[PDB]
């Protein structure tokens, strides 16, 4: 009968949603918060339409990491941001301009509120996945990273010298070494 509060939908600080997005049926709620966050992320960037949504997540083998700050809002919790990850099949150019058919884990979407940015939240999201997915920053690819994410990557994981591509993904020297 009574609509779930944020703490019932997402008990943990970091929540890992699947293709199966997971009193009433909670899915209509979970759906909304994913679509909202998707539009927010898509609007922060100058994107035509959202690249992240409840629908899209149901179609693909991606992982969505939700970070809920439990103290905010009287202790009901608030969603500060998310990080979406999945395996794309890519033809990347190595340092000699030869295409390499590979299928790395990629950062597909990544967003924190416009305010509350430049707090430890993005770094915590990233650090979580990395341990969960058991992977290094350098061995994974990045779908059209923004200036801020490139700043983020360089200062957190020393990722600096990007190997030239043309398919709007980004990999670093260490990706091949
Ligand atoms: C793969 C994709 O689709 S890209 C999607 C990413 N989204 C965007 O491009 C729009 C902007 N990005 C976002 O909205 C994301 O939620 C982010 C970037 C805010 C998440 O990162 P945050 O957690 O805010 O970064 P955080 O505050 O932890 O800062 C980490 C470090 O990166 C640097 N950094 C982060 N954001 C920025 C920025 N906008 N400008 C300059 N430097 C930045 C900082 O220097 C910081 O280190 P320092 O403060 O010690 O120097």
Swiss-Prot record:
GO CC terms in record: axon; clathrin-coated pit; cytoplasm; focal adhesion; microtubule; spindle
Protein localization: Cytoplasm; Membrane, Clathrin-coated pit; Cell junction, Focal adhesion; Cell projection, Axon
Record site: Crucial for catalytic activity: 45
Reaction(s) catalysed by this chain's protein: L-lysyl-[alpha-tubulin] + acetyl-CoA = N(6)-acetyl-L-lysyl-[alpha-tubulin] + CoA + H(+)
GO molecular function, a single term: L-lysine N-acetyltransferase activity, acting on acetyl phosphate as donor
Residue ranges of domain N-acetyltransferase in the record: 1-176
GO biological process: one example: regulation of microtubule cytoskeleton organization
Record bears the keyword Acyltransferase: yes
Keyword tags: Acyltransferase, Cell junction, Cell projection, Coated pit, Cytoplasm, Cytoskeleton, Membrane, Transferase
EC number in record: 2.3.1.108
Highest taxon above the source species: Eukaryota
Result of changing residue 118 to E: Reduces activity to 19%
Residues that coordinate or bind acetyl-CoA: 110-123, 146-155
Phenotype of null mutants: Morpholino knockdown of the protein causes developmental defects at 48 hours post-fertilization (hpf), including cilia curved body shape, short body axis, hydrocephalus, small head and small eyes. Morphants often do not respond, or have slow startle response, when probed with a needle, consistent with neuromuscular defects.
The keyword Cytoplasm is annotated on this UniProt entry: yes
Disulfide-bond pairs as recorded: none
Protein family per UniProt: Belongs to the acetyltransferase ATAT1 family.
Self-association and partners: Monomer.
Cited function: Specifically acetylates 'Lys-40' in alpha-tubulin on the lumenal side of microtubules. Promotes microtubule destabilization and accelerates microtubule dynamics; this activity may be independent of acetylation activity. Acetylates alpha-tubulin with a slow enzymatic rate, due to a catalytic site that is not optimized for acetyl transfer. Enters the microtubule through each end and diffuses quickly throughout the lumen of microtubules.
Identification of the protein by name: Alpha-tubulin N-acetyltransferase 1
Lineage: Eukaryota, Metazoa, Chordata, Craniata, Vertebrata
Shown part of the complete sequence: 2 to 185 of 297
């Amino acid at each position: 009968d009574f609509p779930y509060d944020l703490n019932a939908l997402f008990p943990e600080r970091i929540s890992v949603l699947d293709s199966n997005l997971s009193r009433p049926d909670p899915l209509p709620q979970v759906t909304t918060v994913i679509d909202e966050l998707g539009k927010a992320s898509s609007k922060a960037q100058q994107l035509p339409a959202p690249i992240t949504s409840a629908a899209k997540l149901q179609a693909n083998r991606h992982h969505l990491y939700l970070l809920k700050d439990g103290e905010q809002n009287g202790g009901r919790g608030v969603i500060v941001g998310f990080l979406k990850v999945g395996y794309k099949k890519l033809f990347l150019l190595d340092q000699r301009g030869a295409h390499l058919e590979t299928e790395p884990l990629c950062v597909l979407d990544f967003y924190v509120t416009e305010t509350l940015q430049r707090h430890g939240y993005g770094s915590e999201l990233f650090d979580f996945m990395l341990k969960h997915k058991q992977v290094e920053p350098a061995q994974m690819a990045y779908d059209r990273p923004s200036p801020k994410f490139l700043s983020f990557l360089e200062k957190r994981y020393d990722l600096r010298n990007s190997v030239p591509q043309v398919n709007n993904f980004v990999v670093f020297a260490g990706f091949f070494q």
